Design a protein around this ligand. Structure first.
Ligand code: HEM
Ligand SMILES: CC(c1ccc(O)cc1)c1ccc(O)cc1
Length: 137
């Protein structure tokens, strides 16, 4: 289920963090407007870039903490407000997050593995609802 999925993802975190972000960027190429240093690069080139590895892993480390602190796939309001108020998230709207979780769920469905994709799909919708309540446009 969802809890075990958090353990599975954490057990190969750098790999999953990079592969899910690439799935997102490749499914939604327009989302690179937010990541101009990643333009004009193949996946293997991005996986050679120090900030792409560093940043993807720090993002996913916090994503897994947000998921782990959730009840029934509903994140804490404190975690939603941290994600809205972060200076690095000044430009974003909830649609950026919806798209990320669509790509994450698709990734999991396409994997060989028994991820609980329906729990991740809920988590993404509930995180979007929480971000909207905490003031993200
Ligand atoms: C639950 C999902 C997310 C979490 C937990 C999260 C977390 C973080 C964290 C911890 C950082 C700091 C990274 C560092 O400085 O090394 C960061 C930066 C950033 N995040 Fe988020 N983020 C999420 C979703 C998103 C989404 C959906 C977008 C845009 C589509 C986004 C855009 C950014 C940008 C532009 C930065 C700063 C620039 C950069 O680090 O390359 N984030 N995020
Ligand atoms: C959107 C986010 C991310 C999405 C999915 C992941 O598995 C890891 C990270 C992100 C933020 C800043 C970056 O520099 C790189 C990526």
């Amino acid at each position: 289920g969802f809890k075990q999925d958090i353990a599975t993802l954490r057990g190969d975190l750098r790999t999953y963090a990079q592969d899910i972000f690439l799935a997102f960027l490749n499914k939604y190429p327009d989302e690179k407007r937010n990541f101009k240093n990643y333009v004009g690069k193949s996946d293997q080139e991005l996986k050679s870039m120090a900030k792409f590895g560093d940043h993807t892993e720090k993002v996913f480390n916090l994503m897994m903490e947000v998921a782990d602190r959730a009840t029934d796939c509903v994140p804490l309001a404190s975690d939603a407000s941290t994600l809205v108020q972060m200076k690095q998230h000044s430009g974003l709207t909830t649609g950026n997050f919806e798209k990320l979780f669509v790509a994450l769920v698709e990734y999991m469905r396409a994997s060989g593995q028994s991820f609980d994709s329906q729990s991740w799909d809920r988590f993404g919708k509930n995180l979007v609802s929480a971000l909207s309540s905490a003031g993200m446009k």
